[PDB]
Amino acid sequence: DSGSETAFREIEIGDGFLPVCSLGPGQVGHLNLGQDVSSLRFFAICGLQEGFEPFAINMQRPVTTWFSKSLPQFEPVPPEHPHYEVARMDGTVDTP
Amino acid sequence: EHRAIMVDSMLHTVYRLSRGRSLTKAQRDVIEDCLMALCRYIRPSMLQHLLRRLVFDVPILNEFAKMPLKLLTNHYERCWKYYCLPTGWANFGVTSEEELHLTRKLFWGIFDSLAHKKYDQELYRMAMPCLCAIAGALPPDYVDASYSSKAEKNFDPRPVETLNVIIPEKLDSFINKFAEYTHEKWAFDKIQNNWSYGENVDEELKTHPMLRPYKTFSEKDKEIYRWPIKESLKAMIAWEWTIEKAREGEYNPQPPDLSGVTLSRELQAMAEQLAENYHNTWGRKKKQELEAKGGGTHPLLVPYDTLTAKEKARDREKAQELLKFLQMNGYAVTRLDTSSIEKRFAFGFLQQLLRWMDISQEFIAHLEAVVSSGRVEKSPHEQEIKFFAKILLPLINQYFTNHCLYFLSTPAKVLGSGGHASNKEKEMITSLFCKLAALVRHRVSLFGTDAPAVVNCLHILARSLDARTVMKSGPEIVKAGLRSFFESASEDIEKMVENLRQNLTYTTVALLPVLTTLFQHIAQHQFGDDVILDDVQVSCYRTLCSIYSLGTTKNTYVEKLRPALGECLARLAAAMPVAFLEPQLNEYNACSVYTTKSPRERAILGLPNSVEEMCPDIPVLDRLMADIGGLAESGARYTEMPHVIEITLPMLCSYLPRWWERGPEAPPPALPAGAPPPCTAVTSDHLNSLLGNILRIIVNNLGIDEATWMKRLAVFAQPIVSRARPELLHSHFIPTIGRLRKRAGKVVAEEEQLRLEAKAEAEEGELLVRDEFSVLCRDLYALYPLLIRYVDNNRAHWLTEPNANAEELFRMVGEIFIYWSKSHNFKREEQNFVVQNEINNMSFLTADSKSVQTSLIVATLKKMLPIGLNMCAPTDQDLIMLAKTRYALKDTDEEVREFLQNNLHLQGKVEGSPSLRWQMALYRGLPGREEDADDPEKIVRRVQEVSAVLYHLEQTEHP
């Protein structure tokens, strides 16, 4: 809206970054990382000769992806949970 | 927020000390600055208590209320999203309708107190930012909880006079019955807490211990508890209402007072006034205590409608439950059915300025009637003059600027994020705009100090005033008002034709720019098809030819304002849906009055049944292209034909792009939908030829100095650079950029021999080359925006299929860039020309459509650097960097060429490097790429040029 090309002008490197997508209901996308540079369309227009290596270009195996499986599963209550806490009260006497 | 009660009390005490007496100027200053800086860093959630205290007596609007008004104009300006946006302000919550009604009450109080208090300069200077801030903070779609409020008046709440007012006995039986029932229902509330009411006093009963049924329970204390409800019902009949029962009917009762049922809106308002009755009946006794101490105000002694959610609920919920309990038990009470449209803030607020607009017409009726008298000072409405133009005009300015998206929002075309308006609210803002046009009609000389304010606020009124609902299913009064305004404006332009050969100064500075903005606003909707018809279309019909006659005239008086006329006619050209420039196919055009009307109807409307006869002065678009092609071939000059460039080119470049969408080449949605003929032969060739013609006129008049119209010619050709034929590149863009390159190179040669010259000769020659470089930057800023649009249009094609013309252009613009980088005088003359003609905004406009950061030359270099970056090979990219470190060694370009001839022996290996491997793979598999570029001459030339571009670009960004 201001007119600059970059969406985020300053990002910390931190612990790294990963190609990510969130598809809604009844939505179809094609997450082409760029295993084949010829298969990567519009890359000559944007990304090539600007210094952008296609992500996952030499990686011979297709990149293993991780999807947010919406199946409920029991996991231990974190000690850092900002809403619930679990106390390990000892046995003592007249109390288990 | 954890300890908000004590910050509330501390804010209250600081306000008490700030308005307290026995304080010097500095002593009160410290307290008031503490108040301001304190509220600056306090969440607006807990400030509503101070806002209640503040709205109690800020409407007094005196010196003691000066600084609180400043506090309000800081706070309400700060928390815009908290009060206005339906979604709450970031990291905080959303305002309550409670606090929103304090906002409304504060705005109305300041407005009416300003309308009563006589004009004081000191007061009005500060009161008006507060009004703008409150208007911005309060959202338009907000509706008050009760439109028909009590609106009564340390105010003393007057107790309801129904204690002594007689009560009819046809409805006095149930007053007693209901009061006794509420005592019984209090006992029922006791037993709902598992506390059975006991005949005697018992400690185990946590709630009211001693309670008996009315047969034995003492009548005196029955009346003690029951008198507030008895008085409440007696009030509810006494305040001009009828609580007479709908049906014939009139210690533990299960049904309590409930508020489930809805009932009428005015009856809800009466219930709200009944809550006001509760407040004042309880508040008389509390005010008796308050005046005994003479300190502050009890928190609930402040009006119930200003109280917060819980304390206002203590009366509101009681009123609703009592009235709806009546209605459920068959006891409907009737008091007027005001629509929610009029209940909305925005409708009532702009209607309020409509009523003060007729009051402003009253003071202009006392001003215009006496302006004929010389040296007149009779001002019976001096307060009206010093209120309207002083406060209300920038008030509607700011409000319309900050809520124009909702005025312009439409139930179908939803533009405002908050929402859209009602049809009535859409039409009378148009009527307000027309009545302000009448208010300024022939009054440019009058209120001259506020004349720029009038014209700017009417520009703000000239936008978001038409939601294409007044024209389509709108009140005929407002439709006739706007149609007569159009007819009067066209007759006004017809008066300027006689003048050019007080309306003259009312047009050259007020009516013409506002007409320009209005037509631009119509074009930005692009729904002028329904707006410009019948009277509107005939008025624009004659306006178009009349201003063409002004273009025909060649006196200096029309010369001085012809650019403004040109902007207006371009706007109406993009707002005219008749295809005025195609008279041959006006029957093909459906929007024409010829198509819509019968020949007899045209005759009685005064139309010659033909656009040709209607405009004998303006020919067809084919004739205009023949003219402009002949003029460009003959080398048109700005002194030779100023009218063509500033008048007729706006016609052509506003008609052809917009009417391509109506042209046959534009894809119709379907064959039956596109069954009406396109009524134009423009297609895309006419756009392409028009762009070529303006490029030719710019390069032909590039030599002559002055010609300031280059800037507005460029922004007028902004929509025409898009969708151009690719051959135009080598046909026009390459030759004129080559001419500019060679000219600029001669100027840099003059600068270099000027450095070689003596000192005083260097200074004088430096001034003359500053003049030459300023006109050079003028020509660059006239042409290179077109280059930017063209290169963003065709960058993808030139990158997918490499273009030799594009590479030649790369070398062209690149050596222009290196001239700019070497010449420091060039850079500062670019900045000088930019600050002279305000091109800093124009460069950003060109960049967004399709200083050093906003430098046009470096911008068009970074747009099209990928062209030369494809020109160079990935194996030669290593040579590129090496030549870059070498150029950072400040080596001469002949030297860079010879050492690169040496350096051909260590080109980076592509097969060894995994990155260079695929870069070489794509570069070689590029369809237009050949191995002929491996020749050493081509390698050294292309690597030298490209690496020079990168070097100079990095020196520009960070030396």
SS3 B143: strand
**CA–CA separation, B691 vs B729, rounded Å?**
11
A72 CA to chain B: closest CA distance, Å?
30
- Nearest Cα residue to B694 out of B833, B817, B789, B761: B789
In degrees and rounded to multiples of 5, residue B692 shows phi and psi of -60, -40
**CA–CA separation, B594 vs B305, rounded Å?**
60
**CA–CA separation, B146 vs B558, rounded Å?**
57
- Nearest Cα residue to B560 out of B634, B504, B518: B504
In terms of phi and psi (left: phi > 0; alpha: psi -120 to 50; beta: otherwise), the region of B241 is beta
In terms of phi and psi (left: phi > 0; alpha: psi -120 to 50; beta: otherwise), the region of B390 is alpha
List the single residue in A with minimal CA-CA distance to B798.
Answer: A45
SS3 B272: helix
**CA–CA separation, B548 vs B790, rounded Å?**
31
SS3 B166: coil
Alpha-helical (H) ranges within B239-381 are: 265-293, 309-328, 340-343, 345-371
B922 with A3: Cβ contact below 8 A: no
- C-alpha distances (whole Å) from B128 to each of A59, B349, B403, B451 are 66, 16, 18, 18
Give strand pairing partners of B608.
none
Q: Name the one residue in this structure whose structure tokens are 């009949």.
A: B237
B918 with A44: Cβ contact below 8 A: no
- C-alpha distances (whole Å) from B828 to each of B654, B783, B814, B893, B958 are 35, 19, 19, 25, 17
Q: Are B867 and B809 in contact (CB under 8 A)?
A: yes
**CA–CA separation, B252 vs A96, rounded Å?**
49
In degrees and rounded to multiples of 5, residue B143 shows phi and psi of -120, 140
Tally of CB atoms within 10 A around B350 = 22
According to DSSP, residue B247 is labeled: S
- C-alpha distances (whole Å) from B472 to each of B51, B466, B533 are 44, 11, 11
Contacts of A56 in chain B (CB under 8 A): none
**CA–CA separation, B100 vs B563, rounded Å?**
47
Give strand pairing partners of B143.
B344
**CA–CA separation, B939 vs B764, rounded Å?**
43
Between B796, B847, B918, which is nearest A45 by CB? B796
A84 CA to chain B: closest CA distance, Å?
20
Between A38, A45, A57, which is nearest B800 by CB? A45
Is B926's Cβ below 8 Å from some Cβ in A? yes
- Nearest Cα residue to B491 out of B541, B529, B551: B541
**CA–CA separation, B590 vs B598, rounded Å?**
13
**CA–CA separation, B222 vs B14, rounded Å?**
44
Tally of CB atoms within 10 A around B957 = 11
Q: Which three-class secondary structure string do you get for B55-81?
A: HHHHHHCCHHHHHHHHHHHHHHHHCHH
SS3 B315: helix
Q: Are B8 and B39 in contact (CB under 8 A)?
A: no
In terms of phi and psi (left: phi > 0; alpha: psi -120 to 50; beta: otherwise), the region of B915 is alpha
Instruction: Find the helix packing angle between B621-634 and B649-660, rounded to 10°.
Output: 130
| Chain A, chain B: beta-carbon pairs less than 8 Å apart | 28
According to DSSP, residue B645 is labeled: I
**CA–CA separation, A85 vs B5, rounded Å?**
29
**CA–CA separation, B240 vs B148, rounded Å?**
14
**CA–CA separation, B625 vs B958, rounded Å?**
48
Q: Give, in degrees to the nearest 5, the angle at Cα B243 between B238 and B246.
A: 165
AA letter at B301: L
Tokens of B421: 């308006």
The chain A residues in contact with chain B (CB within 8 A) are: 3, 37-38, 42, 44-45, 48-50, 53, 57-58
Interruption sites in chain A after residues (C→N beyond 2.5 Å): none
Q: What is the resolution of this structure in A?
A: 3.4
B870 with A3: Cβ contact below 8 A: no
- C-alpha distances (whole Å) from B127 to each of A95, B109, B230, B572 are 71, 12, 45, 40
Is B921's Cβ below 8 Å from some Cβ in A? yes
**CA–CA separation, B365 vs B359, rounded Å?**
9
Beta-carbon contacts of residue A36 (< 8 Å; ≥ 6 apart): none
SS3 B334: strand
B926 with A44: Cβ contact below 8 A: yes
Tokens of B737: 């950029």
Tokens of B810: 């790369």
In degrees and rounded to multiples of 5, residue B242 shows phi and psi of -125, 100
**CA–CA separation, B419 vs B85, rounded Å?**
10
In degrees and rounded to multiples of 5, residue B648 shows phi and psi of -75, -35
Beta-carbon contacts of residue B201 (< 8 Å; ≥ 6 apart): B209, B210
Q: Give, in degrees to the nearest 5, the angle at Cα B509 between B507 and B510.
A: 65
SS3 B708: coil
Tokens of B636: 């048109």
Which H helix or E strand runs over B764?
Answer: helix B759-793
- C-alpha distances (whole Å) from B70 to each of B8, B610, B739 are 20, 63, 61
Which H helix or E strand runs over B827?
Answer: helix B824-837
**CA–CA separation, B959 vs B951, rounded Å?**
10
In degrees and rounded to multiples of 5, residue B325 shows phi and psi of -65, -40
SS3 B806: helix
Give strand pairing partners of B334.
B242
Dihedral (CA of B761, B764, B768, B771) sign: positive
Tally of CB atoms within 10 A around B522 = 22
B922 with A57: Cβ contact below 8 A: no
List the single residue in B with minimal CA-CA distance to A59.
Answer: B914
SS3 B344: strand
- C-alpha distances (whole Å) from B667 to each of A78, B28, B661, B674 are 59, 72, 8, 9
Contacts of B870 in chain A (CB under 8 A): 44, 49
Beta-carbon contacts of residue B904 (< 8 Å; ≥ 6 apart): B936, B939, B940
**CA–CA separation, B842 vs B845, rounded Å?**
5
Between B844, B869, B914, which is nearest A49 by CB? B869
Dihedral (CA of B895, B897, B898, B902) sign: positive
A44 with B799: Cβ contact below 8 A: yes
What does R_g of chain B's alpha carbons equal in angstroms? Answer: 38
> What number of residues does chain B have?
959
- Nearest Cα residue to B520 out of B482, B484, B564: B564
According to DSSP, residue A9 is labeled: S
**CA–CA separation, B558 vs B497, rounded Å?**
10
